[PDB]
Amino acid sequence: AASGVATNTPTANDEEYITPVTIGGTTLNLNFDTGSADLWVFSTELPASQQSGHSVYNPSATGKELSGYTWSISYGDGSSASGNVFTDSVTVGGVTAHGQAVQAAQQISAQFQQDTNNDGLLGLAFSSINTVQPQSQTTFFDTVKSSLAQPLFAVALKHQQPGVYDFGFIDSSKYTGSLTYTGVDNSQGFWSFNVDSYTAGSQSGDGFSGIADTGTTLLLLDDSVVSQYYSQVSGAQQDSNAGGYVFDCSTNLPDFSVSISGYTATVPGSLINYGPSGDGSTCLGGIQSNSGIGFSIFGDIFLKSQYVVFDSDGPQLGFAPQA
Amino acid sequence: XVVX
Numbered sequence: 001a002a003s004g005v006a007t008n009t010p011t012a013n014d015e016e017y018i019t020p021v022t023i024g025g026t027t028l029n030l031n032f033d034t035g036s037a038d039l040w041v042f043s044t045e046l047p048a049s050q051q052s053g054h055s056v057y058n059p060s061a062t063g064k065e066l067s068g069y070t071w072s073i074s075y076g077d078g079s080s081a082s083g084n085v086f087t088d089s090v091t092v093g094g095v096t097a098h099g100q101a102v103q104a105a106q107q108i109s110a111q112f113q114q115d116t117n118n119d120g121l122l123g124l125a126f127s128s129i130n131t132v133q134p135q136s137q138t139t140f141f142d143t144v145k146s147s148l149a150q151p152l153f154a155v156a157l158k159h160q161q162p163g164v165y166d167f168g169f170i171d172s173s174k175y176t177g178s179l180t181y182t183g184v185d186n187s188q189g190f191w192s193f194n195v196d197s198y199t200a201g202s203q204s205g206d207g208f209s210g211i212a213d214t215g216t217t218l219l220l221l222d223d224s225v226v227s228q229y230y231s232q233v234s235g236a237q238q239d240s241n242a243g244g245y246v247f248d249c250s251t252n253l254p255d256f257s258v259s260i261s262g263y264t265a266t267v268p269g270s271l272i273n274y275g276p277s278g279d280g281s282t283c284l285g286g287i288q289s290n291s292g293i294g295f296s297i298f299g300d301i302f303l304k305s306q307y308v309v310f311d312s313d314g315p316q317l318g319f320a321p322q323a
Numbered sequence: 324x325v326v327x
């Protein structure tokens with residue numbers, strides 16, 4: 001039975017987490033994204049100038065082309081990418097998926113053009129939302145699932161320290177106490193779960209649903225929740241330069257917690273201080289608006305506090321505080 | 324930051 005551990009590393013300020021992936025022999029640094037189901041990489045089909053500062057896949061060397069197949073995706077922050085498709089061998093922490101679909105980029109928007117931290121994305125959402133046409137493909141995880149000792153993956157993202165992606169097994173030394181599981185609704189292809197209530201500092205409110213997303217930097221919530229949080233932070237103000245609410249870096253921030261199937265998942269105020277807003281004496285808040293999309297995004301800020309198990313049986317998500 |  002297979003299992004493996006892939007180590008991830010945060011970029012500056014924990015903006016993204018990258019992990020090495022070997023495709024047809026070439027190792028690329030990819031961003032693992034539980035909010036999407038496409039495995040796409042920078043490739044030799046891009047203009048030479050866009051290949052700059054990246055490790056690129058050369059499909060011709062080892063890939064098998066799926067003639068006539070295309071892919072095209074748009075993300076939550078305005079970024080998009082499109083290309084063609086090949087199958088190849090994809091290895092992550094010693095687990096190899098043979099015949100995995102690899103989405104080679106032919107076009108990428110400026111956001112990706114400018115980010116030299118990653119060489120593409122490895123999607124870990126449910127395969128129902130893979131964008132390949134005319135026939136969608138399975139994610140790396142769906143591809144190898146049946147060969148793993150357990151059909152699950154778990155993640156420990158950390159603040160400015162290496163973390164891990166555990167494939168096929170649970171590492172009990174990564175958390176304190178026991179895991180608490182909650183059911184997942186994968187009808188929209190996400191690892192979606194329900195929270196029973198939340199507590200923002202001194203104020204508690206009704207529950208809502210959200211997705212566990214390693215590919216989102218912040219904790220994105222409903223504007224009402226964001227207001228209630230920042231109403232308790234002296235001097236908090238929005239700064240479009242920074243990207244949302246900013247405050248004096250020395251501010252004492254309230255904790256944020258959600259109650260999930262009886263378990264209280266707490267994000268300590270120190271983790272809500274994302275970092276220097278990169279403009280004067282302020283820091284960006286780790287809690288920001290979800291722009292009225294109707295569900296919350298439990299991004300890295302939230303994940304840095306927990307060890308999370310993504311279990312295909314259920315499906316369900318288990319949570320415990322990181323050790 | 325980003326929103327995947």
Ligand SMILES: *[C@H]1O[C@H](CO)[C@@H](O)[C@H](O)[C@@H]1O
Nearest residue numbers: 001002003004149168169
């Ligand atoms: C993950 O689990 C597999 C199957 O038990 C082991 O062979 C591997 O070494 C790692 O512990």
